[PDB]
Design a binder for this molecule. Structure first.
Ligand SMILES: OC1CN(C(c2ccccc2)c2ccccc2)C1
Length: 185
């Protein structure tokens, strides 16, 4: 892929984070804490899952960023509507305003309803996410495997401003503490 030149500088929005997350000073890394991180509750925070949004809002154009997923057993990545539900249980689906992929129990899947099996030959250490707002496209690329395509959502009905979306996953196993990191341009 030759999407690199629509590169945008993404930072994380502390105010949207689940109360157990730790966001780095530079707002480019997030990880699961071992407790409540001593923040007040607010209506923006994802309550049930270890999720956080990027600060940037997109309503036009083409945008590209990269995320490091090294050493993690579980995570979700992609974009979502600014209007997504924050409290209680919900599925990741385009009907609920999410365009995502994930790793879970040694398989990769796209967040369709129902979920779609992904075919990845080289487990990725870094993921590229490309959004074309006008075309209605969200695509995922395997940076570890020369940028090979992972998945394309097309005919997307965004229905509002989009935000970068992150889930660091639970760490019941003790093998998923590693952070998600926004990679430099
Ligand atoms: O793995 C769980 C998280 N741990 C907490 C904990 C620590 C001591 C006694 C009981 C509980 C905790 C760790 C660090 C900051 C605040 C609380 C045990």
């Amino acid at each position: 892929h030759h999407h690199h030149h629509h590169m945008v500088h993404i930072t994380l929005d502390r105010n949207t984070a689940n109360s157990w997350l730790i966001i780095s000073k530079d707002r480019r890394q997030v990880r699961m804490g071992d407790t409540h991180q001593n923040v007040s509750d607010n209506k923006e925070r994802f309550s049930n899952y270890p999720m956080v949004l990027g600060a940037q809002r997109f309503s036009s154009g083409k945008m590209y960023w990269e995320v490091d997923v090294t050493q993690k057993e579980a995570w979700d990545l992609g974009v979502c509507r600014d209007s997504v539900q924050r409290k209680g249980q919900f599925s990741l689906s385009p009907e609920n305003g999410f365009w995502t992929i994930w790793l879970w129990q040694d398989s990769y899947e796209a967040g369709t309803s129902p979920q779609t099996t992904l075919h990845i030959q080289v487990p990725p250490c870094q993921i590229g996410i490309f959004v074309d707002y006008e075309a209605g496209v969200v695509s995922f690329y395997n940076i570890t495997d020369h940028g090979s395509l992972i998945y394309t959502f097309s005919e997307c009905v965004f229905a509002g401003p989009l935000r970068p979306f992150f889930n660091v996953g639970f760490n019941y196993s003790g093998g998923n503490a590693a952070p998600l990191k926004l990679c430099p341009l």
